[PDB]
Design a protein around this motif. Structure first.
Motif, PDB file in Angstrom:
ATOM      1  N   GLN A  36      -2.436 -12.438  -0.617  1.00 57.09           N
ATOM      2  CA  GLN A  36      -1.553 -12.380  -1.779  1.00 57.09           C
ATOM      3  C   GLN A  36      -1.822 -11.135  -2.613  1.00 57.09           C
ATOM      4  O   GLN A  36      -0.885 -10.457  -3.050  1.00 57.09           O
ATOM      5  CB  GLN A  36      -1.724 -13.638  -2.629  1.00 57.09           C
ATOM      6  CG  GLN A  36      -1.353 -14.925  -1.910  1.00 57.09           C
ATOM      7  CD  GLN A  36      -2.560 -15.787  -1.592  1.00 57.09           C
ATOM      8  OE1 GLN A  36      -3.490 -15.892  -2.392  1.00 57.09           O
ATOM      9  NE2 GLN A  36      -2.551 -16.408  -0.420  1.00 57.09           N
ATOM     10  N   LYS A  37      -3.098 -10.819  -2.848  1.00 62.54           N
ATOM     11  CA  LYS A  37      -3.429  -9.640  -3.642  1.00 62.54           C
ATOM     12  C   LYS A  37      -2.958  -8.365  -2.955  1.00 62.54           C
ATOM     13  O   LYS A  37      -2.465  -7.441  -3.613  1.00 62.54           O
ATOM     14  CB  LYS A  37      -4.934  -9.588  -3.896  1.00 62.54           C
ATOM     15  CG  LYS A  37      -5.446 -10.690  -4.809  1.00 62.54           C
ATOM     16  CD  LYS A  37      -4.926 -10.523  -6.229  1.00 62.54           C
ATOM     17  CE  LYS A  37      -5.658 -11.432  -7.204  1.00 62.54           C
ATOM     18  NZ  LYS A  37      -7.076 -11.022  -7.392  1.00 62.54           N
ATOM     19  N   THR A  38      -3.101  -8.294  -1.631  1.00 69.98           N
ATOM     20  CA  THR A  38      -2.674  -7.103  -0.906  1.00 69.98           C
ATOM     21  C   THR A  38      -1.169  -6.903  -1.019  1.00 69.98           C
ATOM     22  O   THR A  38      -0.692  -5.773  -1.181  1.00 69.98           O
ATOM     23  CB  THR A  38      -3.092  -7.210   0.560  1.00 69.98           C
ATOM     24  OG1 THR A  38      -4.402  -7.785   0.643  1.00 69.98           O
ATOM     25  CG2 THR A  38      -3.103  -5.840   1.218  1.00 69.98           C
ATOM     26  N   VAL A  39      -0.405  -7.994  -0.944  1.00 68.22           N
ATOM     27  CA  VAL A  39       1.046  -7.900  -1.046  1.00 68.22           C
ATOM     28  C   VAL A  39       1.451  -7.321  -2.396  1.00 68.22           C
ATOM     29  O   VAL A  39       2.519  -6.711  -2.533  1.00 68.22           O
ATOM     30  CB  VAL A  39       1.679  -9.283  -0.806  1.00 68.22           C
ATOM     31  CG1 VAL A  39       3.160  -9.260  -1.143  1.00 68.22           C
ATOM     32  CG2 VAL A  39       1.451  -9.719   0.636  1.00 68.22           C
ATOM     33  N   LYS A  40       0.610  -7.504  -3.416  1.00 67.68           N
ATOM     34  CA  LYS A  40       0.909  -6.958  -4.734  1.00 67.68           C
ATOM     35  C   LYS A  40       0.425  -5.520  -4.872  1.00 67.68           C
ATOM     36  O   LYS A  40       1.140  -4.673  -5.417  1.00 67.68           O
ATOM     37  CB  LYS A  40       0.276  -7.832  -5.811  1.00 67.68           C
ATOM     38  CG  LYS A  40       1.015  -9.136  -6.036  1.00 67.68           C
ATOM     39  CD  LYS A  40       0.293 -10.013  -7.035  1.00 67.68           C
ATOM     40  CE  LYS A  40      -0.931 -10.666  -6.419  1.00 67.68           C
ATOM     41  NZ  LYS A  40      -1.626 -11.573  -7.372  1.00 67.68           N
ATOM     42  N   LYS A  41      -0.782  -5.225  -4.386  1.00 69.31           N
ATOM     43  CA  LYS A  41      -1.304  -3.867  -4.485  1.00 69.31           C
ATOM     44  C   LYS A  41      -0.456  -2.888  -3.687  1.00 69.31           C
ATOM     45  O   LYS A  41      -0.310  -1.722  -4.076  1.00 69.31           O
ATOM     46  CB  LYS A  41      -2.752  -3.832  -3.999  1.00 69.31           C
ATOM     47  CG  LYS A  41      -3.720  -4.668  -4.826  1.00 69.31           C
ATOM     48  CD  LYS A  41      -3.795  -4.224  -6.282  1.00 69.31           C
ATOM     49  CE  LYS A  41      -4.172  -2.755  -6.412  1.00 69.31           C
ATOM     50  NZ  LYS A  41      -4.492  -2.378  -7.816  1.00 69.31           N
ATOM     51  N   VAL A  42       0.101  -3.337  -2.561  1.00 70.33           N
ATOM     52  CA  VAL A  42       0.898  -2.445  -1.729  1.00 70.33           C
ATOM     53  C   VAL A  42       2.151  -2.005  -2.472  1.00 70.33           C
ATOM     54  O   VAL A  42       2.696  -0.929  -2.204  1.00 70.33           O
ATOM     55  CB  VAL A  42       1.238  -3.130  -0.388  1.00 70.33           C
ATOM     56  CG1 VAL A  42       2.408  -4.079  -0.563  1.00 70.33           C
ATOM     57  CG2 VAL A  42       1.520  -2.095   0.694  1.00 70.33           C
ATOM     58  N   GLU A  43       2.617  -2.808  -3.433  1.00 69.25           N
ATOM     59  CA  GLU A  43       3.793  -2.423  -4.199  1.00 69.25           C
ATOM     60  C   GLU A  43       3.494  -1.184  -5.047  1.00 69.25           C
ATOM     61  O   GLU A  43       4.219  -0.180  -4.985  1.00 69.25           O
ATOM     62  CB  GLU A  43       4.255  -3.587  -5.078  1.00 69.25           C
ATOM     63  CG  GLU A  43       4.567  -4.899  -4.354  1.00 69.25           C
ATOM     64  CD  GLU A  43       5.214  -4.699  -2.996  1.00 69.25           C
ATOM     65  OE1 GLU A  43       6.019  -3.754  -2.858  1.00 69.25           O
ATOM     66  OE2 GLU A  43       4.894  -5.461  -2.059  1.00 69.25           O
ATOM     67  N   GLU A  44       2.410  -1.221  -5.837  1.00 63.45           N
ATOM     68  CA  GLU A  44       2.040  -0.029  -6.590  1.00 63.45           C
ATOM     69  C   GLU A  44       1.667   1.114  -5.656  1.00 63.45           C
ATOM     70  O   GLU A  44       1.877   2.283  -5.995  1.00 63.45           O
ATOM     71  CB  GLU A  44       0.886  -0.329  -7.546  1.00 63.45           C
ATOM     72  CG  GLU A  44       1.215  -1.361  -8.625  1.00 63.45           C
ATOM     73  CD  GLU A  44       0.989  -2.786  -8.165  1.00 63.45           C
ATOM     74  OE1 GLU A  44       1.400  -3.713  -8.895  1.00 63.45           O
ATOM     75  OE2 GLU A  44       0.394  -2.980  -7.087  1.00 63.45           O
TER      76      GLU A  44
END
Lengths: 218, 131, 64, 85, 164, 92
Positions: A36-44
């Motif tokens: 879940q965290k990776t899916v968010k960091k990849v956005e930035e």
RNA sequence: ACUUGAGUGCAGAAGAGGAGAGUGGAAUUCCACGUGUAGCGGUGAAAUGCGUAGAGAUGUGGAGGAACACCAGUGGCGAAGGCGACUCUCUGGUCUGUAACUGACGCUGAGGAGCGAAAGCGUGGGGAGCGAACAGGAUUAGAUACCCUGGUAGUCCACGCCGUAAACGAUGAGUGCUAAGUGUUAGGGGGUUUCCGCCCCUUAGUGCUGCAGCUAACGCAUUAAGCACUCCGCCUGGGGAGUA
RNA sequence: AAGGAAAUAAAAUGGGACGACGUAGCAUU
């Protein structure tokens, strides 16, 4: 939601305490990565990449790992950007002048073989020139047309690329990449907690980043 | 034992700052409550909460970081120790870093800082500094 | 390797018996090391104590 | 053992659950120190037992001081019962 | 964030100590020149240089210092607060003074403060008298300085609320 | 409680062995002790010769006493020639 | 007024902890006897020594003194020194789950008192082996030494005395806080399993690698040389001199 | 047969000494 990525090798207890906020756990002494965290960091990650590309980004793709050499090479070639698949030479940035001189010599010798007198001596050429051409194409192929320092840096394993990371931090150049459970998260500017030993994961990530890069030209 | 609670609290806060932690647990005490409230109202702490238990009660503090990585609190130091007490008059109230910092003082009209002390011209136990 | 005692959960070696002690003693009569029998430290110590106790009463050969 | 302790507790007990009061601990320490001394009258070379006895006596003295600082009548009554002077 | 080297610097040298390196064929000499480079407005830099000749080492040290500078909050040509540098057994104190006391410091510290754009300062060395360690301690003390506006921002307070 | 195990020399007739065993059992109970059980392994091959015999008659006795009867048994065993070897172990 | 520090109680765990008595088989020496002969022993080389009186070697028995092979492991205990064969009487401390007990009874500690490696001294034994001094033989230009052959005091025991060691972790005691990885001793709890066993957590002790931090560097790093508090002792250049 | 905890066999006897005093450059162009 688990996207097409399979980046959860979860890298057992050879880990770093500083990555506690990006890991689940499993009954194998192994820490399931928090997808879940990776899916968010990849956005930035995509946002910063597109911004730097629109600004004229010259992202250097670096990985001294068998699982990443061909992947990064293909991604850089299809995207037409720079990369470094073979050994990372010392002082690419700090000693950028020596690398520039070396690659200018490479340009001269590789333009001589077909435009200059490629038949000066019968043995000298075969003895030295072609072997040096091969060696220099191996150690400088992906950066043969740098011509200037980049605005940011891309890596795949800072634990393996501690030298490049250190010199980039010295030059305060923003560095991006994927951090392994055994890597240092704080040292990266744009962190992506994920597995790296999987060829599929690194291939997908590099492809997505190269796509984000190419979309800035529009 | 421990010879005092105040130095323990201050050094624990200093250690948390050094390691860049976000939370802290402390055995709650009236004086500690006042000190934490003072640090909070001054801007060094983003927020503080209290817990009344059956043993000692726990006062939890949250270290503040206003930027990417910058310790709002750089260093701590106690003055009045259990064995060498320090008392400063209203005319000798010590300023910290030309007034940039702040110091805590215990007086008869309540626990006051350097600014409140100068305002009330008070004096008494000079216990510690804050930078 | 696995400890015989723990595998069997047996305690109170009861030195007077020798059927068990015979296995843990070499041919010449010397005690075997823990690293060979894989036994535990506590059980090894108790077994050696019982072995010495038995030897003292002609129940095991000091030499052979 | 385990029987003299019960008798001492019962004699110096203030309540049914009283098992750690200063008087009971002091009586137990006195009995143990007396037994240890009786033992020492023969084994003069056992210095570790002497160190243990010194520690026990220090504990007893600290407890006596605490009792005296807390209650004087109880302290005097305990001394009279044990004759510890 | 390093600042660019494009500034009107003074490149005043401090000293030059002779160095020796032993070899089968006797000794081998080298000149280690330590230089401080800075501008008279909040810009200063320390550098070192080694070579077989004095001017070459001087140029090396000048370039090195240019490659690493630092800013300083010259609040009224004086430091905003007192601080102590304790870099490698080098204890150097720094105090703010009135606007006429002048630069009161040792040789290297005086040169550093002059090339730093500071007029009136009170200082005293309480440790080693080695120029390199003293310069490092002074630079550490300068870097550890604090500005009123940055503290006000971090403290969620105003400058007048802080000092008024 | 203590475990009193001793070896009787093999060169003793059956009735003489019984008499010696009864004597040594009385030695224990005569001091206020009580025997809880006994065991006899008969003639067994000794690991080594004590004085001249290769075999011996192992006798086992379980006793509960106040450390007194066992001391008397120990004192008397060292003198009697009927017992070649003996030991005392606290059953705990 | 209170239980978190402290101590008591309960139910459990380990250990070369100490004092006293006793017991045990290897091994060296000696003695007696049986077999038996040109030597045994020893060094780089050799020599000194014992030996045709019957040696050395071998076999049985006897005598006596010291230490306890295998176990044995940065394993354990102890305040330290230090403690390894085994049984017994006495005795000390440590650790583990408490909640039952009192509710601050706690830390340090000038002086003082006690203990205190080995050596040494007095009294009386004991004396197998080792072995200051000493004797003899090799050695060298010399060898009052290194080497070899013998050998007093000593090494052992009971009482007493002196109270010194690189008595070292060259790091005083107590308390609180400050990333992790990996063995080990003693324990406890749990997530399936009655188990065997795997995992997670929780105390104490003992090692290794390492972040921040500290340090002149070496290096220390939850057992600190880190961040702090309390108490005691210690230093103000070297030689003189731990001398007068 | 790899850096190694308490721990280590094998392994020339024989090489004793070198008076006194002290010799070095260094940057603005």
């Amino acid at each position: 939601l688990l996207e097409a990525g399979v980046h959860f090798g979860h890298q057992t207890r050879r880990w770093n305490p500083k990555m506690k906020r990006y890991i689940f756990t499993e009954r194998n002494g192994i820490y399931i990565i928090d997808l879940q965290k990776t899916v968010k960091k990849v956005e930035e990650a995509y946002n910063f990449t597109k911004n730097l590309a629109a600004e004229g980004g010259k992202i250097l793709f670096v990985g001294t790992k068998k699982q990443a050499q061909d992947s990064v090479k293909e991604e850089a070639q299809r995207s037409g950007m720079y990369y470094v698949n073979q050994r990372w030479l010392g002082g690419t940035l700090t000693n950028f002048e020596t690398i520039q001189k070396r690659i200018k010599r490479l340009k001269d010798i590789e333009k001589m073989q077909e435009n200059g007198t490629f038949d000066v001596l019968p043995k000298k050429e075969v003895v030295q020139l072609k072997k040096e051409l091969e060696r220099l194409e191996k150690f400088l192929g992906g950066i043969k047309d740098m011509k200037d320092l980049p605005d940011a840096l891309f890596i795949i394993d800072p634990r393996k690329e501690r030298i490049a990371v250190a010199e980039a931090r010295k030059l305060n150049i923003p560095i991006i990449g994927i951090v392994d459970t055994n890597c240092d998260p704080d040292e990266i500017d744009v962190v992506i907690p994920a597995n790296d030993d999987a060829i599929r994961a690194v291939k997908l990530l590099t492809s997505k980043m190269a796509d984000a890069i190419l979309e800035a030209k529009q | 034992v421990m010879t005092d609670p105040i130095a323990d609290m201050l050094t624990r806060i200093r250690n948390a700052n050094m390691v860049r932690h976000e939370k802290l647990e402390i055995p709650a005490s009236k004086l500690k409550r006042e000190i934490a409230e003072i640090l909070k109202r001054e801007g060094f702490i983003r927020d503080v909460e209290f817990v009344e238990d059956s043993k000692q009660g726990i006062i939890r503090v949250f270290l503040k970081y206003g930027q990417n990585n910058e310790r709002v609190i750089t260093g701590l130091k106690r003055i009045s120790k259990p064995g060498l007490r320090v008392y400063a008059k209203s005319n000798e109230v010590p300023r910290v870093l030309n007034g940039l910092g702040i110091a805590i003082i215990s007086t008869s009209q309540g626990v006051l800082t350097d600014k409140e002390a100068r305002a009330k011209q008070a004096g008494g136990e000079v216990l510690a500094y804050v930078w | 390797k696995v400890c015989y005692f723990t595998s069997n959960g047996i305690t109170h070696i009861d030195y007077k018996d020798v059927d068990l002690l015979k296995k843990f003693v070499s041919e010449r009569g010397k005690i075997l090391p823990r690293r060979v029998t894989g036994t535990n430290a506590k059980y090894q110590r108790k077994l050696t104590a019982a072995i010495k106790r038995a030897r003292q009463m002609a129940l095991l050969p000091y030499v052979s | 053992t385990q029987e003299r302790k019960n008798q001492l507790i019962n004699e110096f007990k203030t309540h049914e659950s009283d098992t750690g009061s200063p008087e009971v601990q002091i009586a137990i320490l006195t009995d143990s120190i007396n037994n240890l001394n009786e033992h020492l009258r023969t084994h003069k070379k056992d210095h570790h037992s002497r160190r243990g006895l010194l520690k026990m006596v220090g504990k007893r003295r600290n407890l006596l001081t605490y009792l005296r600082n807390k209650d004087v009548t109880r302290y005097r009554e305990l001394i009279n019962k044990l004759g510890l002077r | 964030r390093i600042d660019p080297s494009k500034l009107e610097l003074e490149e005043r040298l401090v000293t030059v100590n002779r160095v020796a390196k032993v070899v089968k064929g006797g000794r081998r000499f080298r000149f280690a020149a330590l230089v401080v480079v800075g501008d008279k407005n909040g810009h200063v830099g320390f550098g070192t240089g080694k070579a077989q000749e004095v001017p070459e080492a001087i140029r090396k040290a000048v370039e090195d210092a240019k490659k690493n500078l630092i800013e300083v909050p010259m609040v009224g040509t004086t430091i905003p607060h007192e601080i102590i540098g304790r870099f490698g057994a080098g204890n150097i104190l720094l105090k703010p003074a009135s606007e006429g006391t002048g630069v009161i410091a040792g040789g290297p510290v005086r040169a550093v403060l002059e090339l730093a754009g500071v007029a009136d300062i009170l200082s005293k060395s309480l440790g080693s008298n080695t120029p390199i360690n003293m310069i490092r301690a002074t630079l550490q003390g300068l870097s550890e300085l604090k500005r009123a506006e940055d503290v006000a921002k971090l403290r969620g307070k105003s400058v007048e609320e802080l000092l008024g | 409680k203590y475990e009193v195990m001793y070896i009787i020399r093999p060169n003793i007739d059956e009735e003489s062995k019984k008499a010696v065993i009864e004597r040594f059992n009385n030695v224990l109970t005569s001091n206020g002790a009580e025997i809880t059980g006994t065991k006899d392994w008969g003639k067994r091959r000794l690991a080594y010769e004590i004085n001249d015999f290769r075999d011996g008659f192992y006798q086992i006795v379980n006793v509960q006493s106040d450390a007194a009867a066992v001391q008397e048994f120990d004192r008397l065993a060292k003198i009697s020639d009927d017992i070649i070897r003996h030991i005392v172990v606290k059953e705990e």
